[PDB]
């Protein structure tokens, strides 16, 4: 399996956003030998690739990040997740799923149409990002930017990300929820524990709060996309002494919003749910990304075909899970689709995807490209 | 001018965060030794303790306190360094300036004065110090007992500087305490996708109702000797800093100052109850920092009223508020125990500061009751 060799490749290089460690280098390496032009694109603290064969339309662009999230308790992985190993079936490491191994079978995918199909139409384009998980501001959406400033559009985008719930391809996503992250620092007055009435605990102010935002019904969704979600990531109050009150409780938390609401709807009924339980705070937003919704055309169609074909499997569109680049791509007019490996153990320890699958991702890619190119 | 401002400056600018002593018992024991105190150094672990004894027979006055401070942080937050001990408007700035170096200062010129003016005092006067009070305190003043009850060496009175004053010096003095059982909450959760929350586990919302429960929670209305039980969440952490990861764990520090009303196990009981209530996975790991403590009202208090009504008019009053000291390891030893120093307003709080006005009158009293126990 090639994809698999340079699964590993790619899997061995720790890449904790926004850190690319030579993983764009090592597609760019590849790609270079099969007649793309390649295109560093510096911005800031990130590394971003766009790679391109062909300079006509259409333009077929497959999309994806090389960054991955933190790993966690290093403990209580059972290998090593930047030290790659296959164990009754299933390869683990940090990125085995979201999303190193979509990468390589894009790569190799890429490498086999060109070799069977040289005179293909068309343009393949690779717009690789390693800041897609985070901040996300000098990544994709960099890239873009220098791609309409030049007026150098994409008929159909792919993003490799894992799409699927139980088996392979059986879920393809043309759109996705909006992402909005907030930074709340609650402020009470560092004291002595035994003296509470000289002090206040942030801590304990807060909790009615937290807790009615966790049980708080956003909204019902709609046909299109799934219900609003709100998760609170991290919490932190106090530096170790056991007798002393903190001044302050740092909340971080995050909304994923269908189209039914706003991000200022959303902020205006948070801000008004922690008046009314008569806190003292500072909340810093940041709109990591819209809701959006591409048409369904020739790449959903594409895709269907190619899925049937190697699986057996009808695919279903959805909105559902988290976000992507594609909302940086979508605005452009690209026809957004979503296909990869399962999602089950994304963002987890011990992250791990069924060797079965990695071939199988290959060829539904290659057909992909032999769909709309030759 | 001050002697007790000097020697409280001396020992501020020594940054003495538990457990390290940073000399201040070598400041107080280079001074006491001048006057006749036989010098015992305890080092047990990493904590440093003193035992300080002047006479060998009874009865035993032993004044007791700790030269740690709790940690300050570069909070910025301070309006001069909290080691870099100043005065402003007339209000002596630093950390443990209140809790409780300025008492530790006070107790030394009073002994070094009344040693002055009553050289054929009867008994002994002793100076129980340690490094570690406000810390996990098990290589501290419980060691100093276990080596002093070993050798059938007996206090009688033990006086703690610790701030006991409320609102102005002296109005309050603690003959008891109430109990400090601490819990370190382990929340076990699934780390994951924020997008994906069915495949993964928050354990800062399954634990977020348990929490607002133990906050609203009524652990008992306490008694006329001791104040209500009170709980209170000190530190919470869950996640390392991304914003689309599930954590897999959230880690709860809590405590509580609990009455007679109540045993620690009777509390940790309740806890895992209401715990479990809610369906969480987890661990506690519990430490009885200390047991309520209540000890009897005999000469001590009465040396100690009259010491404070003569010295600032005020009556003083009885009381086992607060938290928790040394006390509760010299009580079991059958001492009187009785905790008089400057307020606690300010203690283990930012720009932690005491007001200049109360230093000598301190003194005064702590020399005071010395007269009234040793001298006639
Ligand atoms: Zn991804
Ligand atoms: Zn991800
Ligand atoms: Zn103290
Ligand atoms: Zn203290």
Redesign the interface.
Known sequence: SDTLSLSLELLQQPSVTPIDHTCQTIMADRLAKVGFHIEPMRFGDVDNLWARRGTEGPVFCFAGHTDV??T??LD?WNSDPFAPEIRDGKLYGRGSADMKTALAAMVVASERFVAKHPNHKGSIAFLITSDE??PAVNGTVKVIETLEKRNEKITWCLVGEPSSTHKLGDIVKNGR?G?L?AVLKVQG????????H??R?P??EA??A??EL?QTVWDNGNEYFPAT?F?????????????????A?EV?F?F?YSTEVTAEQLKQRVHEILDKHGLQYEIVWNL?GLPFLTPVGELVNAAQTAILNVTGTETELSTS???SDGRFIAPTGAQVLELGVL???????NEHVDVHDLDPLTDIYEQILENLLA
Do not use: D, F, M, W
């Open positions: 999230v933190p966690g308790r209580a998980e985070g929820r992402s992250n007055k560092q004291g002595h524990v035994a003296y509470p000289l002090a605990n801590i304990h909790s009615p937290l807790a966790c979600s998760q609170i990531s991290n919490i932190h109050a106090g530096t170790g002494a056991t007798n002393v009150i903190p001044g409780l971080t995050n994923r990591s899970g988290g976000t999602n089950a153990t994304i963002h987890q320890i």
